[PDB]
Amino acid sequence: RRRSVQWCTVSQPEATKCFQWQRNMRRVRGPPVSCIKRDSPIQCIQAIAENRADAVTLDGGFIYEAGLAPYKLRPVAAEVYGTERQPRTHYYAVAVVKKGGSFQLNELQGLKSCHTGLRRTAGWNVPIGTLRPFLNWTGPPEPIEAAVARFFSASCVPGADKGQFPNLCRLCAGTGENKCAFSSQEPYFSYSGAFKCLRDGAGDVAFIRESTVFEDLSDEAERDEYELLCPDNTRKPVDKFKDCHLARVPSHAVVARSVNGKEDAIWNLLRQAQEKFGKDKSPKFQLFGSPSGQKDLLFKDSAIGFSRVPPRIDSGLYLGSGYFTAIQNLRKSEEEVAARRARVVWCAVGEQELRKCNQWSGLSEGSVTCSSASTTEDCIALVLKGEADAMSLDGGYVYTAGKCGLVPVLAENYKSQQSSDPDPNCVDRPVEGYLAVAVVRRSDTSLTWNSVKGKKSCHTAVDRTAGWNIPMGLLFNQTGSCKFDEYFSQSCAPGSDPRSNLCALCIGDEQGENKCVPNSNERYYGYTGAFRCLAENAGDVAFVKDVTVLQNTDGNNNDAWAKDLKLADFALLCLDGKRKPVTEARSCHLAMAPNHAVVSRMDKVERLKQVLLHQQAKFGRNGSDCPDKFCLFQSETKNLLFNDNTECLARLHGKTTYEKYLGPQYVAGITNLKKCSTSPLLEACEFLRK
Template identity: 35%
Template sequence: MRAMHAILIIFICLHYSLGKKMRWCTVSEQEQKKCAELAKALVAVLPPAAVAAFARLSCVLAYSTTDCINKIRANRADMVTLDAGEVYTAVKQFGLTAIAKEIYSDGGCILAVAVVRNSTLDVRSLQGQRSCHTGARWTAGWSLPLGFLLSRNYLTWAEEQPLSQAVSAFFNASCVPGAAAIAPALCALCQGQKSYIAQRNFHCETAHGEPFYNSQGALRCLKTGAGDVAFVDHTALEGIEESEREDYQLLCTDGTRAPLSHYGSCNLGRGPGQGMVTRPNVRKIARKFLAAAQMAFGRRGRERQRFQLFDSAPFGAADLLFKDVTEKLSILEDNKDISQVLGLDYVALLKGLGHEGSSLEDSVVRWCCISNAEQKKCEQWALSIKSDPLVCVRAISMSDCVEKIKRDEVDAVSLDATHAFIAGKCGLVPVVTEYYGKTCVPAEGGAEKAGHLETAVLPSVVGVAVVKRSTRGVFFGNFGGRRSCHGHMYSPAGWLLPFRHTLSLEHNNTSQCEPNQVYNEVFWKGCLPGSQGNLCKVCMGGTGEAATKRCADNHNERYYGNMGALRCLVGDASGKSYGDVAFVEQHNLESNILSLSPSGWADGWLSWDFELLCGDGRREPLSEWENCNLGAIPPNIIMTRPVLTSRVYDFLMKSQETLASNPDTEFRLFQSQQYGESDLLFKDATQCLIHTSHLDYRTILGDEFYRLAEAVFNCTHSDILEFCNQDVCSIF
């Protein structure tokens, strides 16, 4: 009774606040029938006082989802369910508003899968094949698979051509329902009825009259032999009969194939599921209508025996009005930004694929800088490559760069190994990797593509613990109550590696996995830029145009990074504010020591004045770093959003080629001392940038480092990972 009372109240509200029909837009006779039955069921379950309210549900037949959007805009319909890609278009280009989302058994997202009949095809050999897609600009059938193909450089897309033209050239023939207006060639495989009268034309339309429409239709396209590969969402795989499942396989991103049941690990990416849209002026009543319909006829509805909202079988088709696999509808709060509804990654992907048309941003690369010094170097870089537009965007830390890339406020940045781990977890991908070997060897075919470099081996650097030679009582196991100098928060050498060693015999840190907690317990105070409390008390802040508060997580803090930690160790000009041990990278340690005097920081220091601390308690000269270090550190990785991989890669290769061919230029991409710092934009040890966009970030980092980082972040709070984890798949 309580549930019926709630339904009654909602529908009385509907009746008096709406005062007109609630009109659902359908795209086939089957949907029209299901919608009509929903209207009848609503009347049947209401007491007489609310019958009038329910009788006001009506069904408006359209010839495509695009026609539905136009009808809603023109006040000839009120609501429709759309693929997430169409939701974005409806909101951003046509002023509609999203009011609800479908939630499935495993969350609010779908996985894009590439399905083939058992064959020799793999994801790297799709060029020249026949393709079946769910719909133009749809999540699983268009945006996610094309984003993947672009990120791996399998699909070439020139800036001056429409994406649809690049896709037409890539596949031999296709059926992409909804593509007739933008690229008729993408409709070659479609089978719908053709007519010059729009209402009777179903060829290549996003409507059930096109047999190859949506995920079920794309699978039908594959099953009938019209296409060689179908790009669909994983929920459609349930519709394949058990007796036929062995006839199909999924294409995995690593070039292998897998059974249909392996969609969780063998897919081309994830994105939001379907959503409902309406006009802004009826959004509140539309939400109430959906809530009431779900309360009565949803999975747990009290009136399910009369009508089932998420079942289309009685009407002779699948996924009518809603996907049949929908578990529930999540009614959205008012004034939610579209990026909150669909997810930052997905919205950035759609922008990258040109869903909002071309813009100035499409012709430039926006590089992330975290300090005054980096900004100056970046601007010099931009001036030295005038033909390739580069824009330098400020952030406050490497973590902030990751967030800005995810928000589509910046495009690329070079990240140390720990931040690359974070970025990978946030959905960013590698473009190139810094190479620290002696010589850079062009890849095969490098003559045709100058600057293109590859290697099977990516040399690492090592982290070391450094002390002044004069402080004889400092060694591993005796750090209790000492002062520490760390490069910055999450730095591999300054934050991730040291805590694995016995820092103090008095403090049992072996059972703890949170570095900050270990350092706070062991050291009296220190400088770990980006942290807080005692680990900021030795920091100094910045001065002049780089003025900043103490402990900022960038080069404006004078004790930031490898150079900063060394300054921290020797102290400021007055000999105060110093630490007893510095955790830094070895690659530029000696050059940083030699630069202390010319930079005006501290006079008289030589490499001989410092020693390394070994994990077993020994102290060794700096030259013994190979046998006395904290561990290996994978190289920095330049990362971006998946769809931008090709553009950023081309930009970097042109930069590398331009600068290499002009040795007289004063600008050096991999030198930083002229800006008064070290490792600005890239590590100073970098010899060249190596092509690695075909590799997963985990492969570049290596299993050992990846497992260590994963173990640490499993028990360490991280604002940036928390931000990244609040994606559309987990917030409902």
């Protein structure tokens, strides 16, 4: 499987460094590494895709391209920049000009520009995006490049087609067939090459990264001949880039295959080479250093190391919602872009949720369409990737979403703790929260809270509130043990490892497949599912909510299993040792659980609010188009999409973040449990926040 990593190159100078690295690794008896010779980034991406190479560092822009249809690569290790005191995995895209003229970012038409390359991050993807309003581009078949050519009088944009767009290669200084080329041959290529374009005075502006003026000018006197164009039509010095930049973007990263990518071997070689040939490690070879006339050979010069990129992260999540969809927008009209801007894409966990969602989309008047995934976490990933937008989450999943940057918008407002009748001001009524309780059969009279451990259990699903966070949370306060799979003997807790004791009692869907998956296909998933687990004498205790018991007994649920059950056949376990009836939950419950909340991005908050409020006026609880057509909070006690016992989606009253909504100490509770184990998505977002 691994005994030599193949590193793809794009240049003769680049191949020579590759060979140096090869023989210095041999010099020190460390990890081997072969070298491949190609002529361009796209060729190396193809190379890796057909097992003819292993890995290649690529700019943000080419991470996107490397992750699409045929190839499907992913970032396995990102570059690190800045100082050892303050390492970062991100850089800034700026626009450096000379000192003299008095123009601004909005006064660039008619001027001459100096870019790094086509489809690069700082060089194309950001500048063209910031300047789109000024381009007067009409949209598709006409390439965006064409509009740029009319904008700037002349410029050098390596990689551009000289023949179709001659204006974009006027100021490049290559000779013959090397003019406007995507290689070192063309003098004004990459960061240092584009600042040289500024230098010579060919261009008037140069779109590069922030550290480029510091890398090429020695004395601090030569740097005071340059300022930075700002988004707010202002000029400032080259050291105030923090407060003056076009964008904030991910760093370049070593990519590789998704399926058999030899991730292990890539990281092993990179860390070893980071330790023996990193920042001033050995004068006989420099990993992050190149000869005089060359620049940024195999990795970025003046880099300080690598930093492993977590398994769950893909091309898109890496690039982040802001930059990822911006790349996507360059291949779209202004009409298509603002149209997506104003529609809400709900995510659906499971085919059953998906089916209810399509019904809603048909009657939404094109304000809602749907996406889908097999689990809750996968759907959160989709909102970060910009493919989806919103979704109703249980308090437990609000934390995970919370640490991935999403925020709460509207929360489910269940019938109040006996306050009013079908409340008119439900939308402005503050949320009271629901009650987490434990449930058992009457016949088993010896079962109490002090002896529930050891018996079979019926959970909703892992990382949910009443199902997991609270029951395991109290049991953790006592024992302290992080092994949650020994608390109960056998149990059904969807989301857990299927060959685990935690999935032993699950039964899957009607065919017998899908055991212990955390969507509604599992018969015993969710509140209704956990109670079902109880009633059928699969488990002994079942951690759901009070109203779940009510809603599934005394003929309130006409399905096969719940047809003949009655409310008096069930009791609740109290913390003191006592047991009461289900109606006495107010005085016999484990803890208060905060309401479910519909979350989205910070950029989709205002439109999502005016849409949900409108759609609920139509298909709500007291909705005008209710029974006849469709109802949002109605799916026949399966809780598809929203909870059935939801009155209305309500405002949060200033609790606008995951911290303020859940509550200080609820967040404390979750974190402690997460110390024993984090999810791959939790590990993913943690990387991206740094």
